[PDB]
Amino acid sequence: NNNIIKFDKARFTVLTEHLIRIEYSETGEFEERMTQMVQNREFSEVNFDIIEKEETIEIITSTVHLYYNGGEFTNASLFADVKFNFSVYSNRWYFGEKSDGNLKGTTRTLDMIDGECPLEDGIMSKNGFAVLADKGKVLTEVGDIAGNSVSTIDLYLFAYGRDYRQALKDFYQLTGNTPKLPRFALGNWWSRYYDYSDKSYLALMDKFTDKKVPLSVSVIDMDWHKVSEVPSRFGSGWTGYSWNKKLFPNPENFIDELHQRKLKVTLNDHPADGIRAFEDPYPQVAQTLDLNTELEEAAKFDFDNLKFRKAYFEEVHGPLEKEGVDFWWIDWQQGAISKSGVDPLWLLNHYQYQNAQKKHKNNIILSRYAGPGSHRYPLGFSGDSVISWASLDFQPYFTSTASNIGYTWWSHDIGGHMQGYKDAELSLRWLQFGVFSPINRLHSSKSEFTSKEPWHFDAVIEQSMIDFLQLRHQLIPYLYSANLITASEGRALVEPLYYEYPMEEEAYQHRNQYLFGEQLMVAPITEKMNSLLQMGSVEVWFPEGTWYDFFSGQPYDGKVSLKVYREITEMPVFAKAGAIIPLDKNPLKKEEIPSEIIWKIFPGADGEYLLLEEDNETKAEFVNGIFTVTSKKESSRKHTIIYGEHEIVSAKRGEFSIDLNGKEENFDWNFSTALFRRLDIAEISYEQKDEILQQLSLIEEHEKQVAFIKTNENQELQNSLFELLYSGK
Amino acid sequence: SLRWLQFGVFSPINRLHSSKSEFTSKEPWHFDAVIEQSMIDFLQLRHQLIPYLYSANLITASEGRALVEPLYYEYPMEEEAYQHRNQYLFGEQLMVAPITEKMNSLLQMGSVEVWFPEGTWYDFFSGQPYDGKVSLKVYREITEMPVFAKAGAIIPLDKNPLKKEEIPSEIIWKIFPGADGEYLLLEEDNETKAEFVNGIFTVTSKKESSRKHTIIYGEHEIVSAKRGEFSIDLNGKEENFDWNFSTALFRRLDIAEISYEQKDEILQQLSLIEEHEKQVAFIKTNENQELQNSLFELLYSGK
Amino acid sequence: IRAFEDPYPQVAQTLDLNTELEEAAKFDFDNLKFRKAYFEEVHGPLEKEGVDFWWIDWQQGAISKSGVDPLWLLNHYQYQNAQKKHKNNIILSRYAGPGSHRYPLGFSGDSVISWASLDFQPYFTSTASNIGYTWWSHDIGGHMQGYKDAELSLRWLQFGVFSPINRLHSSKSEFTSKEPWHFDAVIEQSMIDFLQLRHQLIPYLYSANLITASEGRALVEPLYYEYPMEEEAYQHRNQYLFGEQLMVAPITEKMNSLLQMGSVEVWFPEGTWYDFFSGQPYDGKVSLKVYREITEMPVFAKAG
Numbered sequence A: 001n002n003n004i005i006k007f008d009k010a011r012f013t014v015l016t017e018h019l020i021r022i023e024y025s026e027t028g029e030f031e032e033r034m035t036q037m038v039q040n041r042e043f044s045e046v047n048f049d050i051i052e053k054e055e056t057i058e059i060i061t062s063t064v065h066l067y068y069n070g071g072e073f074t075n076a077s078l079f080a081d082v083k084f085n086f087s088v089y090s091n092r093w094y095f096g097e098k099s100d101g102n103l104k105g106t107t108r109t110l111d112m113i114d115g116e117c118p119l120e121d122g123i124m125s126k127n128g129f130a131v132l133a134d135k136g137k138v139l140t141e142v143g144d145i146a147g148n149s150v151s152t153i154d155l156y157l158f159a160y161g162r163d164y165r166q167a168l169k170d171f172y173q174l175t176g177n178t179p180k181l182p183r184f185a186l187g188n189w190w191s192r193y194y195d196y197s198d199k200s201y202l203a204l205m206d207k208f209t210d211k212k213v214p215l216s217v218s219v220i221d222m223d224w225h226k227v228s229e230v231p232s233r234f235g236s237g238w239t240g241y242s243w244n245k246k247l248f249p250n251p252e253n254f255i256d257e258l259h260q261r262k263l264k265v266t267l268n269d270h271p272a273d274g275i276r277a278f279e280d281p282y283p284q285v286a287q288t289l290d291l292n293t294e295l296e297e298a299a300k301f302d303f304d305n306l307k308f309r310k311a312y313f314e315e316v317h318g319p320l321e322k323e324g325v326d327f328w329w330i331d332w333q334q335g336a337i338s339k340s341g342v343d344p345l346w347l348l349n350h351y352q353y354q355n356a357q358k359k360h361k362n363n364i365i366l367s368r369y370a371g372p373g374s375h376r377y378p379l380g381f382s383g384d385s386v387i388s389w390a391s392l393d394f395q396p397y398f399t400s401t402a403s404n405i406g407y408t409w410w411s412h413d414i415g416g417h418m419q420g421y422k423d424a425e426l427s428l429r430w431l432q433f434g435v436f437s438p439i440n441r442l443h444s445s446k447s448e449f450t451s452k453e454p455w456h457f458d459a460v461i462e463q464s465m466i467d468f469l470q471l472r473h474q475l476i477p478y479l480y481s482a483n484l485i486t487a488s489e490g491r492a493l494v495e496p497l498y499y500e501y502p503m504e505e506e507a508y509q510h511r512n513q514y515l516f517g518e519q520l521m522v523a524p525i526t527e528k529m530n531s532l533l534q535m536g537s538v539e540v541w542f543p544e545g546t547w548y549d550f551f552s553g554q555p556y557d558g559k560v561s562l563k564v565y566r567e568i569t570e571m572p573v574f575a576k577a578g579a580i581i582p583l584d585k586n587p588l589k590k591e592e593i594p595s596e597i598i599w600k601i602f603p604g605a606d607g608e609y610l611l612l613e614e615d616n617e618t619k620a621e622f623v624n625g626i627f628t629v630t631s632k633k634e635s636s637r638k639h640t641i642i643y644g645e646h647e648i649v650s651a652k653r654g655e656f657s658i659d660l661n662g663k664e665e666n667f668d669w670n671f672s673t674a675l676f677r678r679l680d681i682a683e684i685s686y687e688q689k690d691e692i693l694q695q696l697s698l699i700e701e702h703e704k705q706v707a708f709i710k711t712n713e714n715q716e717l718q719n720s721l722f723e724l725l726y727s728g729k
Numbered sequence B: 001s002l003r004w005l006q007f008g009v010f011s012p013i014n015r016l017h018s019s020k021s022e023f024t025s026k027e028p029w030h031f032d033a034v035i036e037q038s039m040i041d042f043l044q045l046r047h048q049l050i051p052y053l054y055s056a057n058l059i060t061a062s063e064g065r066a067l068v069e070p071l072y073y074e075y076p077m078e079e080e081a082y083q084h085r086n087q088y089l090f091g092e093q094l095m096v097a098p099i100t101e102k103m104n105s106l107l108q109m110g111s112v113e114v115w116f117p118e119g120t121w122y123d124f125f126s127g128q129p130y131d132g133k134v135s136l137k138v139y140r141e142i143t144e145m146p147v148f149a150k151a152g153a154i155i156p157l158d159k160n161p162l163k164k165e166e167i168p169s170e171i172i173w174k175i176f177p178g179a180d181g182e183y184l185l186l187e188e189d190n191e192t193k194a195e196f197v198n199g200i201f202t203v204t205s206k207k208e209s210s211r212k213h214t215i216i217y218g219e220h221e222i223v224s225a226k227r228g229e230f231s232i233d234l235n236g237k238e239e240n241f242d243w244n245f246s247t248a249l250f251r252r253l254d255i256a257e258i259s260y261e262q263k264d265e266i267l268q269q270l271s272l273i274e275e276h277e278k279q280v281a282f283i284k285t286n287e288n289q290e291l292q293n294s295l296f297e298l299l300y301s302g303k
Numbered sequence C: 001i002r003a004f005e006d007p008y009p010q011v012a013q014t015l016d017l018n019t020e021l022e023e024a025a026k027f028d029f030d031n032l033k034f035r036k037a038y039f040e041e042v043h044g045p046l047e048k049e050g051v052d053f054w055w056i057d058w059q060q061g062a063i064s065k066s067g068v069d070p071l072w073l074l075n076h077y078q079y080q081n082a083q084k085k086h087k088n089n090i091i092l093s094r095y096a097g098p099g100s101h102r103y104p105l106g107f108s109g110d111s112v113i114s115w116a117s118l119d120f121q122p123y124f125t126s127t128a129s130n131i132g133y134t135w136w137s138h139d140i141g142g143h144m145q146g147y148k149d150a151e152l153s154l155r156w157l158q159f160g161v162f163s164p165i166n167r168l169h170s171s172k173s174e175f176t177s178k179e180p181w182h183f184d185a186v187i188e189q190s191m192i193d194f195l196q197l198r199h200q201l202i203p204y205l206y207s208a209n210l211i212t213a214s215e216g217r218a219l220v221e222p223l224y225y226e227y228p229m230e231e232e233a234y235q236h237r238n239q240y241l242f243g244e245q246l247m248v249a250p251i252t253e254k255m256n257s258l259l260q261m262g263s264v265e266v267w268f269p270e271g272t273w274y275d276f277f278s279g280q281p282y283d284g285k286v287s288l289k290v291y292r293e294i295t296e297m298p299v300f301a302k303a304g
Helices: A164-175 A198-210 A251-260 A282-288 A306-323 A344-359 A389-405 A424-435 A459-474 A476-489 A671-681 A686-698 A702-710 A715-727 B002-009 B033-048 B050-063 B245-255 B260-272 B276-284 B289-301 C008-014 C032-049 C070-085 C115-131 C150-161 C185-200 C202-215
Strands: A004-007 A010-016 A019-024 A049-052 A057-060 A064-068 A078-082 A092-094 A130-133 A145-147 A153-158 A188-190 A217-220 A264-269 A327-330 A440-442 A494-496 A514-516 A520-522 A536-542 A546-549 A555-557 A560-566 A573-576 A580-584 A596-601 A607-613 A616-623 A626-631 A638-643 A646-653 A656-659 B068-070 B088-090 B094-096 B110-116 B120-123 B129-131 B134-140 B147-150 B154-158 B170-175 B181-187 B190-197 B200-205 B212-217 B220-227 B230-233 C220-222 C240-242 C246-248 C262-268 C272-275 C281-283 C286-292 C299-302
Touching: A004 A049, A004 A057, A010 A057, A010 A064, A010 A164, A019 A064, A153 A164, A164 A389, A188 A198, A188 A459, A198 A217, A198 A251, A251 A264, A251 A306, A282 A306, A306 A344, A327 A344, A389 A424, A389 A494, A389 A514, A424 A440, A424 A459, A459 A476, A459 A580, A476 A580, A476 A607, A536 A555, A536 A715, A555 A560, A555 A715, A560 A715, A560 B276, A580 A607, A580 A616, A596 A607, A596 A616, A596 A626, A626 A638, A646 A656, A671 A686, A671 A715, A686 A702, A686 A715, A702 A715, A702 B134, A702 B276, A702 B289, A715 B276, B002 B033, B033 B050, B033 B154, B033 C185, B050 B154, B050 B181, B110 B129, B110 B289, B129 B134, B129 B289, B134 B289, B154 B181, B154 B190, B170 B181, B170 B190, B170 B200, B200 B212, B220 B230, B245 B260, B245 B289, B260 B276, B260 B289, B276 B289, C008 C032, C032 C070, C115 C150, C115 C220, C115 C240, C150 C185, C185 C202, C262 C281, C281 C286
Parallel strands: A188 A217, A188 A440, A217 A264, A264 A327, A596 A638, B170 B212
Antiparallel strands: A004 A010, A010 A019, A019 A153, A049 A057, A057 A064, A064 A078, A078 A092, A130 A153, A494 A514, A514 A520, A520 A573, A536 A560, A546 A555, A546 A573, A580 A596, A607 A616, A616 A626, A626 A656, A638 A646, B068 B088, B088 B094, B094 B147, B110 B134, B120 B129, B120 B147, B154 B170, B181 B190, B190 B200, B200 B230, B212 B220, C220 C240, C240 C246, C246 C299, C262 C286, C272 C281, C272 C299
């Protein structure tokens, strides 16, 4: 290509104006094969300039000067200046050195993490550049490990400035797009490390139905297989591939019952102790792998070994798949050691994801993060988080930041995995976040005390959990459409604020705040409520424009940073004037695609929404007060229209256009009602409640209502009252 | 000592006195150069106020009106007039809210919650404006005292407080713009009426004298040392005081014993953010609660 | 020297740069031609306009192709170049390792404005004599960030007056000027008094300077240079000899508001000592806490 330049023992490939591959080869041969990370180096031709001398080369694009002075790559011989002024003297990359500015990415797991842990770098930087080292093995054409690259140094310099979305799109072009998820992945999952029987698991699935909680996925954790029944001469029962016949006497019939309830079924797989001589598949595996059965030779876990992988997929998983297991939960915690030097977690996710496509279209796994490019193998499984306010407070930041290395389908144990402390409000706050996260999978530890069942809790917590779990299914149309946008356009469902607002300092100062698809902005509450107010709070940054609480219609004039207060049953989620959000009208109804969609419109601006589905595209447009719905293909689907407060049209078939210029724009939300409710629940003096209600009702001028609350001795009560006055301004 | 002298100057009688200690002299030069200058300034102000005090004295003797009134004399039906115990009317034209608490060292300012009755009020010293009716915490450096006058207030001042003379040879008429007003200066041997009506300021007296009148309209000295009766039209003249948000903001941030990064962010954000409601939202997020109240006072006066 | 700069056309001609691709003359103090163009064609024109000496403010790391720290290359070559235009000329730059005392003055840089920073700085300054680096210039009052406290500013200036170099400097803040009249009348007068004292001390300082150059004696010595066998000479970290006739114990802690005085524990060696300012006498040998108003500094001289 004209986009390739060789100099001394180095090779430079200008992939985009903002992305340069940098290689070193001792042997004069450079690597064309794919790697664990890189799937594609075919990019459209771009313009750049070169200054090539006897001893030095300079490559010049719109955004970077890359310099190479010959010899081995050192911090002195290989370095780059960006053509940006985001910093005073952090604008230079030096080979092998770290600079300030990296917005971070993700890490393997939250196992044993109570609150924060360190993250790896991503490709996004406030200073406009990042280097992504390719240290992986080469692949063959069909995707097996081929050994060591002949490019013994192979780097990708990203110099996208603060065009983070383009950086991520081009990262997906280099490393491969995220595959499409199946719609079932986006519903509620039930999971618990608990020794259910077939009977008690079905009873619980039937109780969810009776309780009006919709589920898409039934997880069965490790007590599906033998555990205490494993003789100790074999080691533990952590790894298992044999049903516990007491609990599951007829596994296929049990899985058939979950399938009749329209559930997908996954089993926990702890692979590290392989297939030992007590296991039901051991005689077949022993025959295939020529094991010494009289010395009970184990088929040890070895995902570098083609014959082992084949026996694992065909003879260990295969029989369980025939019984109706839909996909695999790979729960790998036993380290990064293999003879090849490839992390066994990477070998599991890569080969198991590929194997899962044989039985079902667009199938998934559930496994931990295996490094850059491992987004090709959804879903992410963060693991054994400690049950704490601190863990919840980290998790939104964790989730949105992961988009910076393209890993956009994290599934967290909703409510936390293990250890930690009981607090029903923590459980409820965690579920609110989970509903507005990539995947909503309830899971817990082996404790008798950690079930995430809503009815574990009091009547208030129970009803709120059921409400949010129903909301998750209402959101599946929006989630599935965003999923197809991830797969086709390389846009994350969960974005940090700085993707949309890269030049706004406040977009970097609200770590737990994020965009959720294109129409919603979420600010989860991740701190225990103030008992004096009976409300939790978070500081929300409202960008320029008019924003509405998604639930209440409470309005906010951006741009402003404002502390917002919500009761434990309520979550801060916001939509702009002109937002159009589809919702399943029948979230409890078992059906492949919604028979009815609610179009929820926020007045005050034009807008539009494209609902992508398996077999259709439906465009909702709101222009000069006219709402129009059209689709590629016709269907019997019935559309409901909600304009602000009011249901305008109920269950109307086919394409149509309705004029909403006539209709009531304003939500009911009003200062006086909200004021009365905040004062009423507060655990403060009745004399203070009486004085605040009286004075805020009597005082007419907005500035004097604010002066009145400014004298209040309760500082947090001032901030709560200020939120209502700001919304009522 | 300095706060006490500020109160004393706006009290019925200003008598410095102390115990038999070697350490309790009320001499201004007992103290450091800052305290000394402020004490001298307030002690000079007391003599500037003698014309106003002597006139109120004759009103006590003849009409049975106190020089110092609780707020509830003027505002008997306002609950807030019973909730500001140290706040008072001082004659008919001034409202005083002495600071009687040690300064907050983080702000380098003391404070008191002031109730502003209905109407437009001005700091007597600075011209900082306040829209009543409101209860508002006000902050002052140790050298400054909260004293307020309504639009239309007319306060006479001795122009020569150090000059030993039985009656002032020169009076300053200090006028607060925005309303009509009047003031009757009662003296041993004279009555002098100052009237401010539809922007016309008039001075007349029972008896003639060689007294020279100076007129200060808001900020500006309009007429210097003019003899006898007269009338001058101030509709032409600049109504507004110099007091401005930006200057006062810079001064409060500059003296505060807070982080320079906080000072820089507040100055930048309050200068950039245009909408009053969003300037108030910005200060509402400040972690320093008393700094919020100080910044709120300036934003309220600048509204 | 990048393509927008006033000297770039001359530097581009000297270094054979590609001006139509706006090739920068990148910083490269290993390169003889770069150094020559930097001194003659970049600094030279500014020197002709009357610039007397160079403040090298290098913060961009220790990387060069040679393995020599670019800060060392700057101090070594710029000090040598500064002698061409003026006799006994200086630079102002950070410490570049042992031997870099040959290139005065030291420039310590971007200290945080705090009592903690001031409390470190006397110990920092006297201890530097132990590697022969005896001309540290600190940003007097602190450089950046930190907190406002007029008394910290005044204490810092008192130290600076009794330090190798008294250079007032500050951050880009609207709130960090070291002008004395930034402060109240008490702080202002005391700062003016100490700034006048610095000029009163120039004869003593210049004489000590010639003693550094000719006899290898530091202006600022730790107590243990004079009193190596006295345990207390190792236990008063901020106390130092200042030339041969003065012993300084700066106050580097906020005053006790009950006393309206700051304090420091002073070790008085054997002999009769006098406060330099007041004449208050002290009989050594003794360790004694001394108290001073914010406007006063503990500085002592022996009988004789």
